[PDB]
Design a protein around this ligand. Structure first.
Ligand SMILES: CNC(=O)/C=C/c1cnc2ccc(O[C@H](C)c3c(Cl)ccc(F)c3Cl)cc2c1
Ligand SMILES: [Cl-]
Length: 285
């Protein structure tokens, strides 16, 4: 009732545009939306699940939490909409440039080594923020990072917005060695995923490990193998990737140390080096 109020949006304030789908998910669809009080453009996820007395309240809990995760590099919640008609709708700010994987794959764009590391740096700061609240993402990947009108990168795909959106149910190519072996996740397993994220950035969104079977990944990693240095990835940034993929989670750098190190590397690049898609990775599912 009273305390919950800063989250809740009235059904009367929300116009969901059901004709205009943004994204398909296991747990519902995403559509453009219009929020009022003024016309604010938003994205609106419909959740199929809802009917429980508990889980309508429980989706109120993560709503409160998500509202407390405001940081420029983290995707925030506008509100939740509790409709007596059918389902509850998660209302998210609208991200002009959509997801980071598709932004860098788009062959109409010309990012430089500087822009790409800048994006990597922005994710590192969101994750630093998340990690400091003791929150483990479990599914960090370029596709799950958003990019707004000012080129702010927002770490996304957590809380009530959590799904698998890509065209099996575990994203094995981004998962740390120990998560694959024990199914358990920590900040240090997000650091591994983050390393794979920097690789996607430096390859402008190539699928990691194209030659490698999804069920063979553990054996691949235990044989001595890692993602190659991308053509345009600086040495010191590749060194950072390798550190993120240390086999022992304690030895991996913290997100604090990632922001500090990547900053150093960022401060040296000035938009002289244009990044272009590599021949081997181009057009691969
Ligand atoms: C060229 N720009 C676009 O296509 C933009 C689309 C857009 C713009 N803003 C968005 C804001 C939130 C959003 O959330 C959904 C549930 C989502 C999706 Cl569909 C995919 C990955 C994610 F990390 C998230 Cl959070 C999806 C959004 C999608
Ligand atoms: Cl550059």
């Amino acid at each position: 009732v009273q305390a919950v109020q800063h989250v809740v949006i009235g059904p009367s304030s929300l116009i969901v545009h059901f004709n205009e789908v943004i994204g398909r998910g296991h747990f519902g669809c995403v559509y453009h939306g219009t929020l009022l009080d003024k016309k604010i453009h938003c994205a609106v996820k419909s959740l199929n699940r809802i009917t429980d007395i508990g889980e309508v309240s429980q989706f109120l809990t993560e709503g409160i939490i998500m509202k407390d995760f405001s940081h420029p590099n983290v995707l925030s919640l506008l509100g939740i909409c509790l409709r007596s008609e059918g389902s509850p709708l998660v209302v998210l700010p609208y991200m002009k440039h959509g997801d980071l994987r598709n932004f860098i794959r788009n062959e109409t764009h010309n990012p430089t080594v500087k822009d790409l590391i800048g994006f990597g740096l922005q994710v590192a700061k969101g994750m630093k923020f998340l990690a400091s609240k003791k929150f483990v993402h479990r599914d960090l990947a370029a596709r799950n990072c958003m990019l707004d009108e000012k080129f702010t990168v927002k770490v996304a795909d957590f809380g009530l917005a959590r799904d698998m959106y890509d065209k099996a149910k575990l994203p094995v190519k981004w998962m740390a060695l120990e998560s694959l072996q024990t199914q358990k996740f920590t900040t240090k397993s997000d650091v591994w995923s983050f390393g794979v994220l920097l690789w996607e950035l430096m390859t402008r969104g190539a699928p990691p490990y194209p030659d490698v079977n999804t069920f063979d990944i553990t054996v691949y990693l235990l044989q001595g193998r890692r993602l190659l240095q991308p053509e345009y990835c600086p040495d010191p940034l590749y060194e950072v990737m390798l550190k993120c993929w240390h086999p022992k989670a304690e030895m991996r750098p913290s997100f604090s140390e990632l922001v500090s190190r990547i900053s150093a590397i960022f401060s040296t690049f000035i938009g002289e080096h244009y990044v272009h898609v590599n021949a081997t990775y181009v057009n691969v599912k």
